[PDB]
Amino acid sequence: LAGDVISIDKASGKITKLGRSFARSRFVQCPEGELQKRKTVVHTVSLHEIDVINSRTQGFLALFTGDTGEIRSEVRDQINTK
Amino acid sequence: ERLLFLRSVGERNEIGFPSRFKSAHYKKPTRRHKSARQLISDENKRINALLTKANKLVPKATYFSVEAPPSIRPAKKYCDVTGLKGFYKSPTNNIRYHNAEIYQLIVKPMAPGVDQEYLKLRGAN
Amino acid sequence: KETKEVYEGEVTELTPEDAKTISHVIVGLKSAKGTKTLRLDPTIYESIQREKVSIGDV
Amino acid sequence: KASQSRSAKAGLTFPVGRVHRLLRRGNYAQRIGSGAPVYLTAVLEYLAAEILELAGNAARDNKKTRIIPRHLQLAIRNDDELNKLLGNVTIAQGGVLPNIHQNLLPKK
Amino acid sequence: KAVVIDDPPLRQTPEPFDEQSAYNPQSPIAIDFGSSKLRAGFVNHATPTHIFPNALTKFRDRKLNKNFTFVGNDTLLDQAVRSQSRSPFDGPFVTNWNLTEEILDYTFHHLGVVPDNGIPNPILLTERLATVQSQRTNWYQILFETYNVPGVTFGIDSLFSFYNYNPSGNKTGLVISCGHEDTNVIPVVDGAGILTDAKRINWGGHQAVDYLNDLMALKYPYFPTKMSYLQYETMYKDYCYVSRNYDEDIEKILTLENLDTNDVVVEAPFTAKEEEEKKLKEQQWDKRLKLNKLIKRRKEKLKLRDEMKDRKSQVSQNRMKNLASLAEDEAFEEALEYEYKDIVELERLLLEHDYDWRNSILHLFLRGPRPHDSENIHEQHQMHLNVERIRVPEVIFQPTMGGQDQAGICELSETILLKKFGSQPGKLSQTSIDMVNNVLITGGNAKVPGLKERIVKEFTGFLPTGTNITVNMSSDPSLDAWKGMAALARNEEQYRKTVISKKEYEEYGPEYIKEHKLGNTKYFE
Amino acid sequence: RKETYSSYIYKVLKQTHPDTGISQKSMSILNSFVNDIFERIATEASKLAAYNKKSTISAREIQTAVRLILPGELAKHAVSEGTRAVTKYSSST
């Protein structure tokens, strides 16, 4: 609705409501500067996460549910080379 | 000498009313000025009269058939002030601009009558 | 011993032809060095339609 | 074939054809152009919207839900350009502003 | 190092006259009635004899003799005679006709021709692509009545150039003409121009120089001197080129590593004890980041004070609304900003001891990579050409930038070579391959650099892979039309195929068109 | 039959303030106000059109009249609103 503060990602189409602006007529501050910003983010991914992801028998939910279940050494060799 | 240098060429490069290079008979007719804007209109109405007479004859090579068709790809958008890539368009005066400080220095405090001249270059008024 | 063969470019023409069951699809590709047309079987056409490929996608 | 009026064609809520009627039999000129009632309709709509906006926050400043000409009078004379426009007009039941000159106070 | 532009210098020597002893009554004479320049010359010579702009004027004296018929090269003698020179063209067409008669009589007098009962030489002429019936009717009447010439032919200048660069007369190619007021794309099949698929774009050199005039007027509204047409013409001629790719070039055109190389500067031509104790206590005396955040908050407070100063702003409107609710119940800000700047300077000094122009994109666009002082007279008479070097010639590829809703030259070539003349997208016919192998660029507006490379790059862009692309180009592309009609007359003897006869004119009338391979065609089928 | 601008004025305050009542005296004040601006603008435009030897009143005549009567800030807001409305109306293609 009008009065909202939102962030739009053009490539993936993800729209997030940061909240409402300062308009008495939650509450956040209206952003400053250019609308189209370019930001650099830094990711730190453990080797176990890539081992779980690269093993096709289970998804990333085994990182949270915990049933990784005896990950083989071949995908460990592929991750160690890559 | 400077005020007679032009007169020397004037008395060298003249031709009288009994023109040597023209014919013996002249019979010069009267003509209107016939500006180029209305020439297109009278050619168009002559051609339209020809189709509406012949119908109640496909044209092959006319003035209105040789002119270029509009494009199929979408047109690129550029900044009206700098000529760079225009990312944003102001909602008040409909001027495409590049970044924030261009909007603050030029696009916002501009006088009326200037935006129509900026839009005249791409013909958007 | 194996071979890898790759086509990659802009889709400029996507015309399938039948004989409810399609027979083959002619796909036109374009890159910065030129264009190239290909014929494709309906099996690859099903994966093309599954990937939601229209005119103008790379 | 049926189409709506010129007002929502211009996106306006004021009557365009009524403005055209008042312009034509108001006896101002013998020929009236097409775009003139739309322009006048937009101008009067904007002026009415600005006046009702000022009456709106003037009435919110008194904690009420209705518009009294006290609020109209206040919203006129605390704004300088409406002061310049409406200098010679008197509003019905308006009163005056609270003002007192500096030396008339008990300065001590 | 600034370059002062000027008007072009005057020609000291007037143009000469051809000798009457060498005049041949039976030789044809070639006349190119261009929009910008007139190219006059006899068939027997290979270089043009008379080159001058198609303009003339009338002078006024004190002694009142009325002896002034200055045409063409004689206007290049003084500023005052040149500044009132008038051309017979209004747009692409010709409106007035008496001045054309005056120019033609001047040309005939300077050709060393002594006639009798009109001109006895056959006339070689040029006409535009798909001209109106009024222009052809008036040309027919004026030539066959005012001058009594035996034989005339009409043809397009681009087809004349294509006949020049392959005189066999039966080749197949693509002609791209960049004229003064239009741009033409004409395909030629077997030596005959297929005029039912030619295309015209309403853009040329005149619109390019006027575009540069409008851009330079809108970039510097406070320029003290008024720039003329010829100065903008010579900055268009000297400082314009076609980029290899526009999208990558406009992204880094204002970066510092590129702007130090391709920025052109053009200069216009012109003629107490408590205080001491406090100081002692001060001497006795993440936190720096907090002080910088406090300085930023002080800058925000200065911005809020400026918003409260402007009564049209919403902050001052809200303050006035609060004052009205209380009623219903700027130098100090500058001094505070100065005190905040002093506190920030003290914090910076404590950190050290105990808004650039380079980031302003408007300043880089306006006055380049150099700092600017507006108080000096010299750079107030100066212009910078950074984006306009590549923006001006790009309009023939994107006409939408020029206000015209037309397709580009590459899209017209693409639809001609890929959706016409029996060519499916994907498979090229023999005619399309023969056209691609003989693409020719002509016209006076081809003098800009980088046109051939850009056309070759885009042609490689849309054609199928492995197709042989060849693009030819003249050394001086403003002369191939006149040499084309000279090659039509001198080299071959089938030139009588195209010749209009006077008796044939009186049999058929003004409504006539010869369907030859090198001229116009019939309006209907 | 008598004419008033009451419904249009009503919807004008309903876009900006929905929970707001109106007095009939205030409605008469507003009606007299809009009619006064209307007759002022109309007599300025008719006088200007008579001054330029022209028998037609067009948009540029009331444009000059709005530049003349209104003070400058409200003048350029008024002509801006009028220009967007007129250009939106003229796009009947």
Coordinates of C-alpha atoms in Angstrom, one line a residue, chain E:
Chain E
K1 CA 45.1 23.3 -24.9
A2 CA 41.9 25.1 -26.2
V3 CA 41.2 25.4 -29.9
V4 CA 39.5 28.5 -31.1
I5 CA 36.9 27.8 -33.9
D6 CA 36.0 30.4 -36.5
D7 CA 34.0 31.0 -39.6
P8 CA 35.8 29.5 -42.6
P9 CA 38.1 32.0 -44.3
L10 CA 36.9 33.8 -47.5
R11 CA 38.0 32.8 -50.9
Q12 CA 40.3 35.4 -52.4
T13 CA 40.2 34.2 -56.0
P14 CA 36.8 34.2 -57.8
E15 CA 36.0 31.2 -59.9
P16 CA 37.1 31.3 -63.6
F17 CA 35.2 30.9 -66.9
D18 CA 35.6 28.0 -69.3
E19 CA 37.0 29.0 -72.7
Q20 CA 34.5 29.5 -75.5
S21 CA 36.8 28.0 -78.1
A22 CA 36.7 24.6 -76.6
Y23 CA 32.9 24.5 -76.3
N24 CA 31.2 21.7 -78.2
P25 CA 27.5 22.2 -79.1
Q26 CA 27.0 18.4 -79.6
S27 CA 28.5 17.3 -76.3
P28 CA 26.3 16.4 -73.3
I29 CA 26.6 18.4 -70.1
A30 CA 26.2 16.9 -66.6
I31 CA 24.6 18.8 -63.8
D32 CA 24.1 17.5 -60.2
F33 CA 21.6 19.8 -58.5
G34 CA 22.3 18.7 -55.0
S35 CA 20.7 20.1 -51.8
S36 CA 24.0 21.3 -50.4
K37 CA 26.4 21.7 -53.4
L38 CA 26.0 21.9 -57.1
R39 CA 28.3 19.7 -59.2
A40 CA 28.7 20.9 -62.8
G41 CA 30.9 19.5 -65.5
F42 CA 31.3 18.3 -69.1
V43 CA 31.1 14.7 -70.0
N44 CA 34.6 14.6 -71.7
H45 CA 36.4 15.4 -68.4
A46 CA 36.7 13.0 -65.5
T47 CA 37.0 15.6 -62.7
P48 CA 34.2 18.0 -61.9
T49 CA 34.7 21.5 -63.4
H50 CA 32.5 23.6 -61.1
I51 CA 31.9 23.0 -57.4
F52 CA 30.1 25.6 -55.3
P53 CA 27.3 25.5 -52.7
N54 CA 23.7 25.8 -54.1
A55 CA 23.0 29.3 -52.8
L56 CA 22.8 32.9 -53.9
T57 CA 21.9 36.4 -52.7
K58 CA 21.2 40.0 -53.8
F59 CA 23.3 43.0 -52.7
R60 CA 22.3 46.6 -52.2
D61 CA 24.4 49.6 -53.0
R62 CA 24.4 53.3 -52.2
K63 CA 24.8 54.3 -55.9
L64 CA 21.7 52.2 -56.8
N65 CA 22.8 50.4 -60.0
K66 CA 21.2 47.0 -59.4
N67 CA 24.0 44.9 -60.8
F68 CA 24.3 42.1 -58.2
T69 CA 23.7 38.5 -59.3
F70 CA 26.1 36.8 -56.9
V71 CA 25.7 33.0 -57.1
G72 CA 27.6 30.2 -55.4
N73 CA 31.4 30.7 -55.1
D74 CA 31.0 34.5 -55.2
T75 CA 29.2 34.4 -51.9
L76 CA 32.6 33.3 -50.4
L77 CA 34.0 36.8 -50.7
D78 CA 32.7 38.7 -47.5
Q79 CA 30.7 38.0 -44.4
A80 CA 27.8 40.3 -45.3
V81 CA 27.2 38.8 -48.7
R82 CA 27.4 35.2 -47.3
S83 CA 25.2 35.8 -44.3
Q84 CA 22.2 36.7 -46.5
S85 CA 22.7 33.9 -49.0
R86 CA 19.5 32.0 -49.8
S87 CA 19.2 28.4 -51.2
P88 CA 16.4 27.4 -53.6
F89 CA 15.6 24.3 -51.4
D90 CA 13.0 24.4 -48.6
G91 CA 13.3 20.9 -47.1
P92 CA 14.1 18.2 -49.6
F93 CA 12.0 19.9 -52.4
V94 CA 12.4 23.1 -54.4
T95 CA 9.7 25.7 -53.8
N96 CA 10.8 28.9 -55.6
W97 CA 11.9 28.6 -59.2
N98 CA 13.2 32.0 -60.3
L99 CA 16.4 31.6 -58.2
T100 CA 16.9 28.2 -59.7
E101 CA 16.8 29.9 -63.1
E102 CA 19.3 32.5 -61.9
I103 CA 21.7 29.7 -60.7
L104 CA 21.3 27.8 -63.9
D105 CA 22.0 30.9 -66.0
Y106 CA 25.1 31.5 -63.8
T107 CA 26.2 28.0 -64.4
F108 CA 25.6 28.1 -68.1
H109 CA 27.5 31.4 -68.3
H110 CA 30.5 30.0 -66.3
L111 CA 30.5 26.9 -68.6
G112 CA 31.7 28.9 -71.6
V113 CA 28.6 28.2 -73.6
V114 CA 27.4 30.5 -76.4
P115 CA 23.9 29.3 -77.4
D116 CA 21.4 30.2 -80.1
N117 CA 17.6 29.9 -79.6
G118 CA 18.1 28.2 -76.2
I119 CA 20.7 25.6 -75.1
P120 CA 21.5 23.0 -77.9
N121 CA 23.2 20.6 -75.5
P122 CA 21.5 17.5 -74.0
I123 CA 21.0 17.8 -70.2
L124 CA 22.0 15.2 -67.6
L125 CA 20.1 15.7 -64.4
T126 CA 19.5 14.2 -60.9
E127 CA 16.2 13.8 -59.0
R128 CA 15.2 12.5 -55.7
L129 CA 13.8 9.0 -54.9
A130 CA 10.0 8.9 -55.6
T131 CA 9.6 12.6 -56.2
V132 CA 6.2 14.3 -56.4
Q133 CA 4.5 15.0 -59.7
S134 CA 4.7 18.8 -59.2
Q135 CA 8.5 18.8 -59.1
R136 CA 8.8 16.6 -62.2
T137 CA 6.2 18.7 -64.1
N138 CA 7.9 21.9 -63.2
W139 CA 11.3 20.5 -64.1
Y140 CA 9.9 19.4 -67.5
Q141 CA 8.3 22.7 -68.2
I142 CA 11.3 24.8 -67.1
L143 CA 13.8 22.8 -69.0
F144 CA 11.9 22.3 -72.2
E145 CA 10.6 25.9 -72.4
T146 CA 13.1 28.1 -70.6
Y147 CA 16.2 26.5 -72.2
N148 CA 14.9 24.5 -75.3
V149 CA 17.2 21.6 -74.6
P150 CA 17.0 18.6 -77.0
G151 CA 17.2 15.7 -74.5
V152 CA 17.0 15.2 -70.8
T153 CA 17.3 12.2 -68.5
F154 CA 16.5 11.8 -64.8
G155 CA 18.1 9.4 -62.3
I156 CA 18.9 9.0 -58.6
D157 CA 22.3 9.9 -57.4
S158 CA 22.8 6.7 -55.4
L159 CA 22.0 4.6 -58.5
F160 CA 24.4 6.8 -60.4
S161 CA 27.1 6.0 -57.9
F162 CA 26.3 2.3 -58.1
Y163 CA 26.6 2.5 -61.9
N164 CA 29.9 4.3 -61.4
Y165 CA 31.5 1.7 -59.2
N166 CA 30.4 -1.2 -61.4
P167 CA 30.0 -0.1 -65.0
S168 CA 28.8 -3.4 -66.4
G169 CA 25.2 -2.4 -65.7
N170 CA 23.8 -5.8 -64.7
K171 CA 25.3 -6.4 -61.2
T172 CA 23.5 -7.0 -58.0
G173 CA 24.1 -5.0 -54.8
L174 CA 22.9 -2.8 -51.9
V175 CA 23.3 1.0 -52.1
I176 CA 23.3 3.0 -48.9
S177 CA 23.2 6.7 -49.5
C178 CA 23.8 9.3 -46.7
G179 CA 22.5 12.4 -48.3
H180 CA 22.0 16.0 -47.0
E181 CA 18.4 15.7 -45.9
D182 CA 17.6 11.9 -46.2
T183 CA 19.2 8.5 -45.9
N184 CA 18.3 5.9 -48.6
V185 CA 18.6 2.1 -48.7
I186 CA 18.1 0.8 -52.2
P187 CA 18.6 -2.8 -53.4
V188 CA 19.7 -3.4 -57.0
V189 CA 18.8 -6.7 -58.7
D190 CA 20.6 -7.4 -62.1
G191 CA 21.6 -3.7 -62.5
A192 CA 18.0 -2.4 -62.1
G193 CA 17.1 -0.7 -58.8
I194 CA 14.1 -2.4 -57.3
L195 CA 12.3 0.8 -56.1
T196 CA 9.3 -1.1 -54.6
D197 CA 11.5 -2.1 -51.6
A198 CA 13.8 0.9 -51.2
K199 CA 13.5 2.8 -47.9
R200 CA 14.0 6.4 -46.8
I201 CA 14.8 7.9 -43.4
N202 CA 14.2 11.6 -42.7
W203 CA 17.6 12.4 -41.3
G204 CA 20.7 13.9 -42.8
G205 CA 23.6 16.3 -42.3
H206 CA 21.4 19.3 -41.9
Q207 CA 19.4 17.7 -39.1
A208 CA 22.6 16.5 -37.5
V209 CA 24.1 20.1 -37.4
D210 CA 20.8 21.4 -36.1
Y211 CA 20.7 18.7 -33.5
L212 CA 24.2 19.7 -32.4
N213 CA 23.0 23.4 -32.3
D214 CA 20.1 22.4 -30.1
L215 CA 22.2 20.3 -27.8
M216 CA 24.9 23.0 -27.4
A217 CA 22.2 25.7 -26.8
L218 CA 20.6 23.6 -24.1
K219 CA 23.9 22.6 -22.5
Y220 CA 25.1 26.2 -22.0
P221 CA 22.2 28.6 -21.6
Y222 CA 24.4 31.5 -20.4
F223 CA 26.8 31.7 -23.4
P224 CA 27.5 35.4 -24.1
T225 CA 28.2 35.1 -27.9
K226 CA 25.8 33.6 -30.4
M227 CA 27.3 30.8 -32.5
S228 CA 26.5 30.6 -36.2
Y229 CA 25.7 27.6 -38.4
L230 CA 29.1 27.2 -40.0
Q231 CA 30.9 26.9 -36.7
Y232 CA 28.6 24.1 -35.6
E233 CA 29.1 22.6 -39.0
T234 CA 32.9 22.5 -38.6
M235 CA 32.6 21.1 -35.0
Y236 CA 30.4 18.4 -36.5
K237 CA 32.9 17.7 -39.3
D238 CA 36.0 17.7 -37.1
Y239 CA 34.7 16.2 -33.8
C240 CA 32.2 13.4 -34.6
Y241 CA 32.7 9.7 -35.1
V242 CA 30.7 6.5 -34.9
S243 CA 31.3 4.2 -32.0
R244 CA 31.9 0.4 -32.4
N245 CA 29.2 -0.2 -29.8
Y246 CA 27.1 2.5 -28.3
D247 CA 25.9 0.7 -25.1
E248 CA 29.4 0.0 -23.8
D249 CA 30.7 3.4 -24.9
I250 CA 28.1 5.5 -23.1
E251 CA 28.7 3.7 -19.8
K252 CA 32.4 4.7 -19.5
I253 CA 32.3 8.0 -21.5
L254 CA 32.3 10.1 -18.2
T255 CA 34.8 8.0 -16.3
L256 CA 38.1 9.7 -15.6
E257 CA 40.3 7.1 -17.4
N258 CA 38.5 7.8 -20.7
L259 CA 37.6 11.5 -20.3
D260 CA 41.3 12.5 -20.2
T261 CA 41.6 11.3 -23.9
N262 CA 38.5 12.1 -25.8
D263 CA 37.3 15.4 -24.4
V264 CA 37.6 18.3 -26.8
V265 CA 37.6 21.9 -25.7
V266 CA 36.3 24.6 -28.0
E267 CA 36.9 28.3 -27.4
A268 CA 34.5 30.9 -28.8
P269 CA 36.1 33.8 -30.7
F270 CA 36.0 37.2 -28.9
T271 CA 37.7 40.5 -28.7
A272 CA 39.5 37.1 29.9
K273 CA 41.0 35.2 32.9
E274 CA 38.1 32.7 32.6
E275 CA 38.9 32.3 28.9
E276 CA 42.6 31.6 29.7
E277 CA 41.6 29.1 32.4
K278 CA 39.3 27.3 29.9
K279 CA 42.1 27.2 27.3
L280 CA 44.4 25.7 30.1
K281 CA 41.8 23.0 30.8
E282 CA 41.5 22.2 27.1
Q283 CA 45.3 21.8 26.9
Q284 CA 45.2 19.5 30.0
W285 CA 42.6 17.4 28.1
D286 CA 35.1 4.3 17.8
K287 CA 34.8 7.7 19.6
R288 CA 36.1 9.3 16.4
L289 CA 33.4 7.4 14.4
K290 CA 30.8 8.6 16.9
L291 CA 32.1 12.2 16.4
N292 CA 31.8 11.7 12.7
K293 CA 28.2 10.5 13.2
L294 CA 27.6 13.6 15.3
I295 CA 28.9 15.7 12.4
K296 CA 26.6 13.9 10.1
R297 CA 23.7 14.5 12.5
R298 CA 24.7 18.2 12.6
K299 CA 24.6 18.2 8.8
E300 CA 21.1 16.7 9.0
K301 CA 20.2 19.4 11.5
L302 CA 21.4 22.0 9.0
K303 CA 19.3 20.3 6.3
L304 CA 16.3 20.4 8.6
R305 CA 17.0 24.1 9.3
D306 CA 17.1 24.7 5.5
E307 CA 13.8 22.8 5.1
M308 CA 12.3 24.9 7.9
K309 CA 13.6 28.1 6.2
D310 CA 11.8 27.2 2.9
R311 CA 8.1 27.7 3.7
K312 CA 7.0 25.6 0.7
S313 CA 8.7 22.5 2.3
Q314 CA 6.7 20.0 4.3
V315 CA 8.8 20.5 7.4
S316 CA 8.0 24.3 7.6
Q317 CA 4.4 23.5 6.7
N318 CA 4.3 21.0 9.6
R319 CA 5.9 23.7 11.9
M320 CA 3.2 26.2 10.8
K321 CA 0.5 23.6 11.4
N322 CA 1.9 23.1 14.9
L323 CA 1.9 26.8 15.5
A324 CA -1.7 27.0 14.3
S325 CA -2.6 24.1 16.6
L326 CA -0.9 26.1 19.4
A327 CA -3.0 29.1 18.4
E328 CA -6.1 26.9 18.4
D329 CA -5.2 25.3 21.7
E330 CA 18.4 31.7 9.1
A331 CA 21.7 33.4 10.1
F332 CA 21.6 31.6 13.4
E333 CA 21.4 28.3 11.5
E334 CA 24.4 29.3 9.5
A335 CA 26.3 30.1 12.6
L336 CA 25.3 26.8 14.1
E337 CA 26.5 25.0 11.0
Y338 CA 29.8 27.0 11.2
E339 CA 30.2 25.9 14.8
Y340 CA 29.5 22.3 13.9
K341 CA 32.1 22.5 11.1
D342 CA 34.5 24.0 13.7
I343 CA 33.7 21.1 16.1
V344 CA 34.3 18.6 13.2
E345 CA 37.6 20.3 12.4
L346 CA 38.6 20.1 16.1
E347 CA 37.6 16.4 16.2
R348 CA 39.7 15.8 13.0
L349 CA 42.7 17.6 14.6
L350 CA 42.3 15.5 17.8
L351 CA 42.2 12.3 15.7
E352 CA 45.3 13.4 13.7
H353 CA 47.3 14.6 16.7
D354 CA 46.1 12.7 19.9
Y355 CA 31.8 17.1 -2.1
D356 CA 34.7 16.9 -4.5
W357 CA 34.4 17.9 -8.1
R358 CA 35.9 14.6 -9.1
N359 CA 32.7 12.8 -7.9
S360 CA 30.3 15.3 -9.5
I361 CA 29.1 13.8 -12.7
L362 CA 27.5 17.1 -13.9
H363 CA 30.9 18.9 -13.5
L364 CA 32.6 16.1 -15.5
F365 CA 29.9 16.4 -18.2
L366 CA 30.1 20.2 -18.3
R367 CA 33.8 21.1 -17.9
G368 CA 35.6 17.8 -18.2
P369 CA 38.4 16.5 -15.9
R370 CA 39.6 20.0 -15.0
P371 CA 38.7 22.2 -12.1
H372 CA 36.7 25.3 -13.0
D373 CA 36.8 28.9 -12.0
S374 CA 33.9 30.9 -13.5
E375 CA 35.5 34.3 -12.9
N376 CA 38.0 34.1 -15.8
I377 CA 36.9 35.4 -19.2
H378 CA 38.5 32.6 -21.2
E379 CA 36.6 29.5 -20.0
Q380 CA 33.3 31.4 -20.0
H381 CA 33.8 31.4 -23.8
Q382 CA 34.4 27.6 -23.9
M383 CA 32.5 24.4 -24.6
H384 CA 33.4 20.7 -23.9
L385 CA 32.5 17.9 -26.3
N386 CA 32.4 14.6 -24.4
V387 CA 29.1 12.8 -25.0
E388 CA 28.2 14.7 -28.2
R389 CA 31.1 13.2 -30.2
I390 CA 29.3 9.9 -30.4
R391 CA 25.6 10.9 -29.8
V392 CA 25.2 13.0 -33.0
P393 CA 26.1 10.3 -35.6
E394 CA 24.1 7.6 -33.7
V395 CA 20.8 9.0 -34.9
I396 CA 21.0 7.3 -38.3
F397 CA 21.1 4.0 -36.4
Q398 CA 18.4 5.0 -33.9
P399 CA 16.0 7.6 -35.4
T400 CA 13.9 7.6 -32.2
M401 CA 16.6 9.8 -30.7
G402 CA 16.0 12.3 -33.4
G403 CA 12.2 12.5 -32.9
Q404 CA 11.4 10.3 -35.9
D405 CA 9.5 7.1 -35.4
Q406 CA 11.4 5.1 -38.0
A407 CA 13.5 1.9 -38.0
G408 CA 17.3 2.1 -38.1
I409 CA 19.6 1.5 -41.0
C410 CA 20.6 -1.9 -39.7
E411 CA 17.1 -3.1 -39.2
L412 CA 16.1 -2.0 -42.8
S413 CA 19.1 -3.9 -44.2
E414 CA 18.1 -6.8 -42.0
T415 CA 14.5 -7.0 -43.2
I416 CA 15.6 -6.5 -46.9
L417 CA 18.2 -9.2 -46.7
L418 CA 16.3 -11.6 -44.5
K419 CA 12.5 -11.3 -45.2
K420 CA 12.4 -10.2 -48.9
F421 CA 13.3 -11.5 -52.4
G422 CA 12.9 -15.2 -51.6
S423 CA 15.0 -15.4 -48.4
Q424 CA 13.7 -17.3 -45.4
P425 CA 15.2 -16.5 -42.0
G426 CA 17.9 -19.1 -41.8
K427 CA 18.5 -19.7 -45.5
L428 CA 19.8 -17.0 -47.9
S429 CA 19.0 -17.1 -51.6
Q430 CA 21.6 -16.4 -54.3
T431 CA 20.3 -12.8 -54.7
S432 CA 20.8 -12.1 -51.0
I433 CA 24.3 -13.5 -51.1
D434 CA 25.1 -11.4 -54.2
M435 CA 23.7 -8.3 -52.4
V436 CA 25.8 -9.0 -49.3
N437 CA 28.9 -9.4 -51.4
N438 CA 28.6 -6.0 -53.0
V439 CA 27.3 -3.5 -50.3
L440 CA 28.3 0.0 -51.3
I441 CA 28.2 3.2 -49.1
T442 CA 27.9 6.6 -50.9
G443 CA 26.8 10.1 -50.1
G444 CA 28.3 13.2 -48.7
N445 CA 27.5 12.4 -45.1
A446 CA 29.7 9.3 -45.1
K447 CA 32.8 11.5 -44.2
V448 CA 32.4 10.5 -40.5
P449 CA 34.8 7.8 -39.3
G450 CA 33.8 4.4 -38.1
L451 CA 30.7 4.0 -40.3
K452 CA 32.1 1.1 -42.4
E453 CA 33.4 -0.8 -39.3
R454 CA 30.1 -0.4 -37.5
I455 CA 28.1 -1.5 -40.5
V456 CA 30.4 -4.6 -41.0
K457 CA 30.1 -5.5 -37.3
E458 CA 26.3 -5.3 -37.3
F459 CA 26.1 -7.1 -40.6
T460 CA 28.1 -9.9 -39.1
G461 CA 25.7 -9.6 -36.1
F462 CA 22.5 -10.5 -37.9
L463 CA 23.7 -12.7 -40.9
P464 CA 24.2 -16.5 -40.8
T465 CA 27.6 -17.6 -39.8
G466 CA 30.2 -18.0 -42.5
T467 CA 28.5 -15.5 -44.9
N468 CA 31.1 -13.5 -46.9
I469 CA 30.4 -9.8 -46.2
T470 CA 32.1 -7.1 -48.4
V471 CA 31.6 -3.4 -48.0
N472 CA 33.1 -1.0 -50.5
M473 CA 33.6 2.8 -50.0
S474 CA 34.9 5.7 -52.1
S475 CA 37.8 7.8 -51.1
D476 CA 35.7 11.0 -51.6
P477 CA 32.1 9.9 -51.6
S478 CA 30.7 13.2 -52.7
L479 CA 31.8 12.8 -56.3
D480 CA 30.5 9.3 -57.4
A481 CA 27.1 10.6 -58.6
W482 CA 28.6 13.1 -61.1
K483 CA 31.2 10.5 -62.2
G484 CA 28.2 8.1 -62.5
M485 CA 26.4 10.2 -65.0
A486 CA 29.7 10.9 -66.8
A487 CA 30.1 7.1 -67.0
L488 CA 26.6 6.7 -68.3
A489 CA 27.2 9.2 -71.1
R490 CA 30.9 8.7 -72.1
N491 CA 31.6 5.0 -71.5
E492 CA 28.4 3.4 -73.0
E493 CA 26.4 4.2 -76.1
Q494 CA 23.0 2.9 -74.9
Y495 CA 22.5 6.2 -73.2
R496 CA 20.0 7.0 -75.9
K497 CA 17.8 4.3 -74.3
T498 CA 16.9 6.8 -71.5
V499 CA 16.8 10.1 -73.5
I500 CA 13.5 12.1 -73.4
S501 CA 12.8 13.7 -76.8
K502 CA 11.0 16.9 -77.3
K503 CA 8.6 15.5 -79.9
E504 CA 7.8 12.6 -77.6
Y505 CA 7.2 15.2 -74.8
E506 CA 4.6 17.0 -76.9
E507 CA 3.0 13.6 -77.9
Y508 CA 2.7 12.4 -74.3
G509 CA 2.7 15.5 -72.1
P510 CA 3.9 16.3 -68.6
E511 CA 2.5 13.0 -67.2
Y512 CA 5.3 10.7 -68.3
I513 CA 7.9 8.5 -66.8
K514 CA 10.6 6.4 -68.5
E515 CA 10.9 2.9 -67.0
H516 CA 14.6 2.5 -67.3
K517 CA 16.9 0.6 -64.9
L518 CA 18.6 3.7 -63.4
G519 CA 15.8 6.2 -62.7
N520 CA 12.4 6.4 -61.1
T521 CA 9.3 4.3 -61.8
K522 CA 5.6 4.5 -62.3
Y523 CA 3.5 5.5 -59.3
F524 CA 0.9 2.7 -59.8
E525 CA 0.9 -0.8 -61.3

